[PDB]
């Protein structure tokens, strides 16, 4: 019924979609709500589910997932924007497209077996398992999925930074 974009779509690639009516919560349909704290600490291994291209670049007909660990957000920027100093920043993304990097992003590298996310996986959730509470929380939303196996870091939009804005839109 409605497709709401972010007020700053050039800084946070996030958009909310409203359905006409509520969807029944079956065993194959279940919402995942927002965390109260930040799980984007280096070493937090999270699961990413994807509907995008596979190693043959054809869209997958089955849902797949892979564990990706969060990475230090200095070597991610230096790998993409050349340096952490704004004056010396130059576009050197090994895929030819510059990711949108700022304080509302965190980068997750490849898995142990050299797995990553190619095109068509944007909008997916970087879900982490809170073993103490046994609940799945969304810590990031995939934004720059064009890295595939060439680059070494995928850019995810932090959920906590947009938690305040998401609640306001839902209320209306």
């Amino acid at each position: 019924e409605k497709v709401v974009l972010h007020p700053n779509y050039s800084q946070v690639d996030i958009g909310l979609i409203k359905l006409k009516q509520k969807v029944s919560v079956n065993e194959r349909v279940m919402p995942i709500c927002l965390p109260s704290k930040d799980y984007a600490e280096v070493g937090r291994v999270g699961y990413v589910s994807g509907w995008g291209r596979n190693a043959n670049f054809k869209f997958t007909d089955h849902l797949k997932y892979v564990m990706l660990p969060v990475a230090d957000q200095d070597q991610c920027i230096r790998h993409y924007e050349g340096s952490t100093v704004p004056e010396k920043k130059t576009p050197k993304s090994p895929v030819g497209v510059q990711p949108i990097l700022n304080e509302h992003t965190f980068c997750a590298g490849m898995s142990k077996y050299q797995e990553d996310t190619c095109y068509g996986d944007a909008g997916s959730a970087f879900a982490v398992h809170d073993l103490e509470e046994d609940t799945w929380y969304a810590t990031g939303i995939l934004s720059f999925d064009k890295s595939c196996a060439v680059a070494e870091y995928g850019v995810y939009v932090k959920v906590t930074s947009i938690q305040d804005w998401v609640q306001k839109t839902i209320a209306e």
Binding site: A55, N56, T60, Y113, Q114
Partner: protein, 146 residues
Amino acid sequence: VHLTPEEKSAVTALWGKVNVDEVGGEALGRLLVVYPWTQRFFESFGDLSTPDAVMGNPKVKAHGKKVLGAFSDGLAHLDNLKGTFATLSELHCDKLHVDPENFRLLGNVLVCVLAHHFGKEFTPPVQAAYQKVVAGVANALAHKYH
């Protein structure tokens, strides 16, 4: 049905020259080093960290014989491929959970391995028939999935 009689003759002809003992180990060893996410399924085969260990591991070579023979068994009759691989497809879907893409990747590597072992005899029309054979096998082993 699927293939013309001239296409079928060449495919059956080349399959005679193959060395089943070494070709199976070659293709499996290449897939485990080119796409290194299949090492997870073959943890029962010991060390697989380095390419020489992957090639020199006896278990993958023996598993290559099983893979190659099943490919030859599939070539027996094309319309039976649904029933030929139904027993094996269940194993790869309910117990190991092998994604259908890995079937397409292993078949593609098999074409490269056969081209490497043969050479100029891998005529482009010959490989076209082989790819059609590989595409059916990858689909047949995946048609169990639902």
